[PDB]
Amino acid sequence: ISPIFQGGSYQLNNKSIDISSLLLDKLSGESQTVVMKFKADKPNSLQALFGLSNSKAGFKNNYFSIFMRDSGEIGVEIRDAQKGINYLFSRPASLWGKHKGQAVENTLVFVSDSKDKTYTMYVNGIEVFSETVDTFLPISNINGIDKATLGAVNREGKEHYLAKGSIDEISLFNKAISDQEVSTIPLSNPFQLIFQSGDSTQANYFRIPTLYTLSSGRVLSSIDARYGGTHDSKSKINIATSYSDDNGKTWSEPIFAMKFNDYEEQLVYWPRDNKLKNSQISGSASFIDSSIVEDKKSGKTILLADVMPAGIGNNNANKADSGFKEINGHYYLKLKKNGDNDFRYTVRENGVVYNETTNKPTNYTINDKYEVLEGGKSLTVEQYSVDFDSGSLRERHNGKQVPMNVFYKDSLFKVTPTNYIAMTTSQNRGESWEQFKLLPPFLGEKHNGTYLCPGQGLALKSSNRLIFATYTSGELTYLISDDSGQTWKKSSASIPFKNATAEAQMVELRDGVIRTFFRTTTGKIAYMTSRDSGETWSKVSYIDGIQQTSYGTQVSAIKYSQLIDGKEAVILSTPNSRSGRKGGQLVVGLVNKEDDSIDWKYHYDIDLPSYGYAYSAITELPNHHIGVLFEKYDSWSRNELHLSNVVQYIDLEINDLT
Ligand SMILES: COc1cccc(CNCCS(=O)(=O)O)c1
């Protein structure tokens, strides 16, 4: 079905374009679709792209607008004072500005549907809001509309919300086009999605991306599949993975590397209003923060993640307890039974549940999947589902039985409410994953477990050594295996911080020489160096030339395989900003062989300084391109919680960076 208006190549240079004569008399009926392809690489703070207004005296609040902010937020207003209606729908972090130095053509589709009383906005193929109202307001039914305007809104004869940008194509339809028809509108996206809302994970949200290039050429990604909005644990979160066999061009349907069944995997639209946005799934077990490494010797892929029992996160995790008991220099997982006040059980060899008060064993065993068996028979619990039908979050039994797991709220036997580290392996490069195994405590019986640094582990090039960085109060705790992840030992490296989220990632500068880059609380990224393949660690130094916030952000890092400007090169990915998680950059550093110092020579801006960029994952693709999977939004900001499809993937070449 044809547009009632089609126009193109409009330059918005702080001067509105009047299209009233062309458009206004064409508008008919109560349903409309706006399709617009536009660039804005230097937007004003708040600017309107399109406006339909009553421009007369006394009617300044009678207008429809499509607007954007220099934060990347997109929205509309639909206002009519006579009707007492002032609608505003918007979503932060919905836009691109630039990619490889060039302004990005954003594709916006806005649907105003009088029959369903629903307003829906898509940007770049992503639905960013869909809102139904009791009292519908057709956009051309605003009392006294007499102006159609590009690049401003005409109110009382003046240009409000002047825009800087361009509208390369704009079309209007006297129909609410279907979601199907929307899907056929061609896009000019600079990015792709690996994980996305409605995929096999059925999580509506994703955080904490990782990337790793396997020896076969397959590129593997892992991620937090986050169900209860974007909240850290406590929530329901699983760890999902996807891989690409064609240098990141296409990606497999995700599968789970680590998951719990105590709560249903539900695709939920988590409330974003101030009253409810802190609603949190409070009774589910969860995983959080994954990291991947490949072992050259066995060929296995190893993935670790933090594990949280039901109701548990970092804020309420039992510090002062590892969750294990030491009996002979061996560690056993503690368990508490229904009705006891203390943990009077342990899980011994082969999974036998022992009673500790009487050193007498039980008729209960824990299988490989941490599920409870009584006399070899699988115990079950009823699953929970969540909903907001009542006007607040509700967590309730759904009639389905699932194996009873010791990390569950409803389990007969429960682990200590603290954080653990789990490991799984894959023998087929991410096509399937084993059942996870808990790592032992490394800092003692009465120390809670360390926190995994999300991203990559390190496989040393000249040995079989595998390292996963973790952090805790006062130190980085490196976990080291020389036997394909069968056994681990720790290597502690003190840092001058108490209670820092010291997320750390490593690069091997040359054989046996590791530089670790890490998040701090100082506004600068720190580093330390090992020259004995991780046995001992230097004092902490700081990078100048990159700014982070006081609270910091995860940083990703790789050793590039090729020389640049004749030198060994390292590439860092991080926001570069002392204000928020925005201004994403890749920073190319050249190693000085004299002293292993790094000269941070090239800074590549991923997108606008004002556009969001948070946790990130970088990998050198088999073709020597650079793959970047990153949170394209401010994942700290309390205004940008619970956004869908903001973790995105781009492909870059080194010449783009320099
Ligand atoms: C709250 O429970 C946690 C369990 C493991 C790790 C973490 C750290 N997540 C920090 C992310 S952010 O707030 O800096 O975006 C949190």
XYZ file of C-alpha atoms in Angstrom, residues 38-43 68 70 72 95-106 124 164 188-191 583-584 604-613 630 632 648 650-652:
45
model
C 17.748 9.813 9.149
C 21.280 10.645 10.268
C 22.325 12.609 13.316
C 26.030 12.493 14.100
C 26.066 15.892 15.797
C 22.645 16.154 17.442
C 15.560 12.416 19.963
C 21.959 13.497 22.312
C 20.564 8.363 21.828
C 20.005 5.097 18.057
C 23.327 4.948 16.217
C 25.328 8.073 15.376
C 28.490 7.039 13.512
C 30.249 3.822 12.485
C 33.762 3.795 10.984
C 33.716 7.596 10.953
C 30.564 7.842 8.825
C 27.103 9.009 9.963
C 24.723 6.033 10.360
C 21.378 5.916 8.526
C 18.855 5.050 11.250
C 16.869 -0.200 13.174
C 20.867 19.195 13.421
C 21.045 0.037 6.914
C 22.316 -1.287 10.252
C 26.018 -1.037 11.219
C 25.481 -3.825 13.755
C 32.022 7.289 24.560
C 33.061 3.761 23.687
C 38.812 4.681 17.677
C 35.420 6.083 18.694
C 32.832 3.285 18.456
C 30.004 5.821 18.260
C 29.282 9.334 19.611
C 30.940 10.494 22.865
C 27.425 10.922 24.279
C 26.082 7.499 23.166
C 26.086 4.577 25.595
C 28.848 1.991 25.836
C 29.105 -4.736 23.624
C 25.311 -0.226 23.693
C 25.106 -5.609 19.754
C 30.054 -5.014 15.004
C 32.912 -5.960 12.685
C 35.962 -3.708 12.323
